[PDB]
Amino acid sequence: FFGPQY
Amino acid sequence: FFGPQY
Amino acid sequence: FFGPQY
Amino acid sequence: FFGPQY
Amino acid sequence: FFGPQY
Amino acid sequence: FFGPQY
Amino acid sequence: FFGPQY
Amino acid sequence: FFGPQYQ
Amino acid sequence: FFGPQYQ
Amino acid sequence: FFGPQYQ
Amino acid sequence: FFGPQYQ
Amino acid sequence: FFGPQYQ
Amino acid sequence: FFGPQYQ
Amino acid sequence: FFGPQYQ
Amino acid sequence: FFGPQYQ
Amino acid sequence: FFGPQYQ
Amino acid sequence: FFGPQYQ
Amino acid sequence: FFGPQYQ
Amino acid sequence: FFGPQYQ
Amino acid sequence: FFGPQYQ
Amino acid sequence: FFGPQYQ
Amino acid sequence: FFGPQYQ
Amino acid sequence: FFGPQYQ
Amino acid sequence: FFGPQYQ
Amino acid sequence: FFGPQYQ
Amino acid sequence: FFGPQYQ
Amino acid sequence: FFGPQYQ
Amino acid sequence: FFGPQYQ
Amino acid sequence: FFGPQYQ
Amino acid sequence: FFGPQYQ
Amino acid sequence: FFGPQYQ
Amino acid sequence: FFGPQYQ
Amino acid sequence: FFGPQYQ
Amino acid sequence: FFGPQYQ
Amino acid sequence: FFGPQYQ
Amino acid sequence: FFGPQY
Amino acid sequence: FFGPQY
Amino acid sequence: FFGPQY
Amino acid sequence: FFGPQY
Amino acid sequence: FFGPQY
Amino acid sequence: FFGPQY
Amino acid sequence: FFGPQY
Amino acid sequence: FFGP
Amino acid sequence: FFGP
Amino acid sequence: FFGP
Amino acid sequence: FFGP
Amino acid sequence: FFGP
Amino acid sequence: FFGP
Amino acid sequence: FFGP
Amino acid sequence: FFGP
Amino acid sequence: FFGP
Amino acid sequence: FFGP
Amino acid sequence: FFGP
Amino acid sequence: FFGP
Amino acid sequence: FFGP
Amino acid sequence: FFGP
Amino acid sequence: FFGPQY
Amino acid sequence: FFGPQY
Amino acid sequence: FFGPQY
Amino acid sequence: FFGPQY
């Protein structure tokens, strides 16, 4: 699972 | 799963 | 799954 | 699945 | 699991 | 598990 | 488990 | 080969 | 090969 | 091979 | 091979 | 092989 | 082989 | 083989 | 697949 | 797959 | 897969 | 997989 | 997997 | 896995 | 696994 | 690709 | 890729 | 990749 | 990769 | 990798 | 890796 | 690794 | 690829 | 790849 | 890869 | 890889 | 890898 | 690897 | 590995 | 025939 | 035929 | 034929 | 044919 | 043919 | 053919 | 053929 | 062909 | 071919 | 071919 | 081929 | 081939 | 081959 | 091969 | 796309 | 994509 | 993608 | 991806 | 990824 | 990843 | 990773 | 869609 | 979609 | 999707 | 998806 979690 | 989660 | 989720 | 989800 | 967790 | 936890 | 824990 | 561009 | 670009 | 780019 | 880039 | 880059 | 880089 | 780098 | 970026 | 960045 | 960064 | 950084 | 850093 | 640092 | 440091 | 960058 | 960078 | 960097 | 760095 | 560093 | 460092 | 250091 | 540089 | 540098 | 340096 | 240095 | 140094 | 040093 | 030193 | 002729 | 001729 | 001719 | 000719 | 010719 | 010729 | 020729 |  |  |  |  |  |  |  |  |  |  |  |  |  |  | 259907 | 269907 | 279906 | 299905 990639992708930032603001 | 790619793509930011604002 | 690509593509941002505003 | 591509394409932004405003 | 990659991707920063602000 | 990688990715910083601010 | 890697990744800093500020 | 996969490489789409965003914004 | 996978490599998408964001912002 | 996996290598996406962020910001 | 895995190597993503952040900020 | 694993080697991601941060900041 | 494991070797990630921080800051 | 394990060898991560900090700061 | 060629996709390089110049600024 | 070629994707290098220049600034 | 080639992806180097120049500043 | 090639990914070196120059400053 | 090649990833060296130059400053 | 190659990752040396130069300053 | 190669990782030496030069200053 | 024949592509150098000059400043 | 033929690509050097000059300053 | 033919890619040196000069300053 | 043919890549030296000069200053 | 052909990569020396000079100052 | 062919990599010496000179000063 | 071919890597000596000189001063 | 041919590209020499003079002066 | 051919690229010599003069002066 | 061919790249000599003069003067 | 060929790269001699003169003077 | 070939790289001699003169003077 | 070949790399002699003169003078 | 070959590397003699003169003078 | 690349080189200059000063 | 790369080199200059000073 | 790389070298210069001073 | 790498070397110079002083 | 690497060396110089002083 | 590495060496110089003084 | 490494050595110099003084 | 360089041949004078 | 260098041959004068 | 260097051959004068 | 160096051969004068 | 060095052979004069 | 060094052979003059 | 050194052989003059 | 097989999709009945 | 097999998806009935 | 096998996904019925 | 096996995921029914 | 086996994940029903 | 076995994870039902 | 075995983790049901 | 390669295979036969006996 | 390679295989046969006996 | 390689295998047969007896 | 290699194996057969007897």
Added chain:
Amino acid sequence: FFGPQY
């Protein structure tokens, strides 16, 4: 996904 299914 190698194995058979008797």
Added chain:
Amino acid sequence: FFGPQY
């Protein structure tokens, strides 16, 4: 995922 399933 190597093994058989009798």
Added chain:
Amino acid sequence: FFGPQY
């Protein structure tokens, strides 16, 4: 995941 399942 090597072993059989009798």
Added chain:
Amino acid sequence: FFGPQYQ
């Protein structure tokens, strides 16, 4: 390249 063989 695709080329299966039957019976």
Added chain:
Amino acid sequence: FFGPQYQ
């Protein structure tokens, strides 16, 4: 390259 064999 794809080429399975049956019966």
Added chain:
Amino acid sequence: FFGPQYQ
């Protein structure tokens, strides 16, 4: 390269 064999 893919090539399984049956029966």
Added chain:
Amino acid sequence: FFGPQYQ
């Protein structure tokens, strides 16, 4: 390289 054998 992939190549299993059955029966």
Added chain:
Amino acid sequence: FFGPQYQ
């Protein structure tokens, strides 16, 4: 390299 054998 992958190659198991059955029955």
Added chain:
Amino acid sequence: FFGPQYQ
């Protein structure tokens, strides 16, 4: 290298 044997 992977190669188990059954029955």
Added chain:
Amino acid sequence: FFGPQYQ
């Protein structure tokens, strides 16, 4: 290297 034997 991996290679177990059964029955």
Added chain:
Amino acid sequence: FFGPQYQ
């Protein structure tokens, strides 16, 4: 080149 030979 797509080229098998059969008898």
Added chain:
Amino acid sequence: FFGPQYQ
């Protein structure tokens, strides 16, 4: 080259 031989 896709090239097997059969008899």
Added chain:
Amino acid sequence: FFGPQYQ
């Protein structure tokens, strides 16, 4: 090269 031989 994809090339097995069968009899």
Added chain:
Amino acid sequence: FFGPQYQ
């Protein structure tokens, strides 16, 4: 090279 031999 993908090349087994069967009889």
Added chain:
Amino acid sequence: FFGPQYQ
């Protein structure tokens, strides 16, 4: 080289 021999 992927190359076993069977009889």
Added chain:
Amino acid sequence: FFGPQYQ
């Protein structure tokens, strides 16, 4: 080399 022999 992946190469066993069977009879």
Added chain:
Amino acid sequence: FFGPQYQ
């Protein structure tokens, strides 16, 4: 070398 022999 992965190479056992069976009878």
Added chain:
Amino acid sequence: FFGPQYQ
């Protein structure tokens, strides 16, 4: 450069 022979 492709040049194979069939008899």
Added chain:
Amino acid sequence: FFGPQYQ
């Protein structure tokens, strides 16, 4: 450079 022979 490809040049195989079949008989």
Added chain:
Amino acid sequence: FFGPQYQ
């Protein structure tokens, strides 16, 4: 450089 022989 590929050159194998089949009989």
Added chain:
Amino acid sequence: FFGPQYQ
């Protein structure tokens, strides 16, 4: 350089 023989 690949050159194997089959009979």
Added chain:
Amino acid sequence: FFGPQYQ
């Protein structure tokens, strides 16, 4: 350099 023989 690969050169094995099969009979």
Added chain:
Amino acid sequence: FFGPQYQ
């Protein structure tokens, strides 16, 4: 340098 013989 690989050169094994099978009979």
Added chain:
Amino acid sequence: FFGPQYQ
């Protein structure tokens, strides 16, 4: 240097 014999 690998060279084993099978009969």
Added chain:
Amino acid sequence: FFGPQYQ
């Protein structure tokens, strides 16, 4: 690349 054919 050189490969002429005789008779």
Added chain:
Amino acid sequence: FFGPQYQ
């Protein structure tokens, strides 16, 4: 690369 054919 050199490979001429005779008779």
Added chain:
Amino acid sequence: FFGPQYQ
């Protein structure tokens, strides 16, 4: 790479 064929 050198490999000519005779008769």
Added chain:
Amino acid sequence: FFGPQYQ
């Protein structure tokens, strides 16, 4: 690499 074939 040297490997010519005779008769």
Added chain:
Amino acid sequence: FFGPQYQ
């Protein structure tokens, strides 16, 4: 690497 074949 040297390995010619006779008869």
Added chain:
Amino acid sequence: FFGPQYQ
């Protein structure tokens, strides 16, 4: 490495 084959 030296290994020629006779008859």
Added chain:
Amino acid sequence: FFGPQYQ
């Protein structure tokens, strides 16, 4: 390393 084969 020396290992030639006779008859």
Added chain:
Amino acid sequence: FFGPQY
């Protein structure tokens, strides 16, 4: 030099 010398 290529080419037969009958």
Added chain:
Amino acid sequence: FFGPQY
């Protein structure tokens, strides 16, 4: 130099 010399 190519070409037979009968």
Added chain:
Amino acid sequence: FFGPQY
């Protein structure tokens, strides 16, 4: 030097 010398 290639080419047979009958």
Added chain:
Amino acid sequence: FFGPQY
């Protein structure tokens, strides 16, 4: 030097 010497 390659090429047979009948």
Added chain:
Amino acid sequence: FFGPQY
């Protein structure tokens, strides 16, 4: 030196 000497 390669090549048979009948």
Added chain:
Amino acid sequence: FFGPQY
């Protein structure tokens, strides 16, 4: 020196 000497 390689090559048979009949």
Added chain:
Amino acid sequence: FFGPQY
């Protein structure tokens, strides 16, 4: 010196 001397 390699090569048989019949």
